[PDB]
Amino acid sequence: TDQLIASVVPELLPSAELYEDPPGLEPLPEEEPLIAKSVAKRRNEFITVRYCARQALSVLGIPEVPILKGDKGQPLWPDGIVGSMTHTEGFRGAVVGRTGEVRSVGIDAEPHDVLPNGVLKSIALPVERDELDALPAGTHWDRLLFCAKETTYKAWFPLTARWLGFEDAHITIDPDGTFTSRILVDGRANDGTVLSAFDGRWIIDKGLILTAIVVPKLA
Numbered sequence: 001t002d003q004l005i006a007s008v009v010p011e012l013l014p015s016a017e018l019y020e021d022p023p024g025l026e027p028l029p030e031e032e033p034l035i036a037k038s039v040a041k042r043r044n045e046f047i048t049v050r051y052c053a054r055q056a057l058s059v060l061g062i063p064e065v066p067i068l069k070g071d072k073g074q075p076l077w078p079d080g081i082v083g084s085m086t087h088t089e090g091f092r093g094a095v096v097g098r099t100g101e102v103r104s105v106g107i108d109a110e111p112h113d114v115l116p117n118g119v120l121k122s123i124a125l126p127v128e129r130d131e132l133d134a135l136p137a138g139t140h141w142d143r144l145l146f147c148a149k150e151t152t153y154k155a156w157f158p159l160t161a162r163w164l165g166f167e168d169a170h171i172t173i174d175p176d177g178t179f180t181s182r183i184l185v186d187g188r189a190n191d192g193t194v195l196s197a198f199d200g201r202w203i204i205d206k207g208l209i210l211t212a213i214v215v216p217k218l219a
């Protein structure tokens with residue numbers, strides 16, 4: 001009803017989220033090596049986010065399956081599926097969709113708080129600093145910019161297999177719940193197209209920021 005991800009992605013991309021770790025969850029056997037020596041926060045975020053991912057996959061008709069990690073950390077979905085996952089204090093969530101419907105999806109959740117000391121200087125272009133200062137009072141625009149940049153990478157990486165730095169995209173945030181990401185580097189993609197700009201959506205609720213980008217199919 002009031003799920004954050006569902007508010008920022010199309011209905012044809014099922015999503016699921018939780019705000020706490022249900023007690024007693026375990027990963028699938030194939031997933032255990034990915035968190036073998038991990039601390040409690042990492043184990044629990046990994047397990048619960050995959051619980052949410054499998055719930056969303058079931059809506060698309062896909063029964064229980066491991067969700068392993070690819071070359072540079074990207075989640076590895078079944079044939080015909082794209083998706084994205086995110087976890088932070090107070091949130092685990094996942095979204096999935098069919099490749100016949102969209103090219104890529106990225107999401108990212110952050111607490112709705114001022115960025116840690118020094119992070120804004122590291123991630124924002126000078127022009128972005130000025131733009132954030134101009135936006136209306138009452139939202140942590142610095143944290144929203146950071147969130148949006150991470151969503152940009154998540155949407156970009158499965159389509160390019162290349163790094164994208166914080167300095168390599170200019171994100172413009174609108175108060176209306178949308179943002180744009182303008183790519184400043186070579187945007188050639190692995191399907192033969194060029195990625196120059198992404199359209200994003202954002203919501204703040206439950207003390208969290210959630211950003212999302214869907215990269216549509218082309219004609």
Ligand SMILES: CC(C)(COP(=O)(O)OP(=O)(O)OC[C@H]1O[C@@H](n2cnc3c(N)ncnc32)[C@H](O)[C@@H]1OP(=O)(O)O)[C@@H](O)C(=O)NCCC(=O)NCCS
Pocket residue numbers: 045046049069072073074075084085086087088107108109149150151152153154155157158164165166167168169
């Ligand atoms: C990878 C990264 C984006 C993760 O974002 P984050 O906000 O720190 O963490 P989240 O909890 O939201 O997301 C973590 C999940 O992202 C996904 N992920 C990791 N690497 C990924 C990649 N290369 N491509 C897509 N998704 C990826 C994984 O599913 C991971 O969860 P898991 O390890 O449990 O499977 C971030 O840590 C990072 O390294 N960023 C550097 C690149 C960047 O953001 N550039 C800005 C471009 S403008």
Ligand SMILES: [Mn+2]
Pocket residue numbers: 045086087088
């Ligand atoms: Mn996380």
Ligand SMILES: [Mn+2]
Pocket residue numbers: 108109110147150
């Ligand atoms: Mn994040």
Ligand code: NA
Pocket residue numbers: 071072161162163
């Ligand atoms: Na690579």
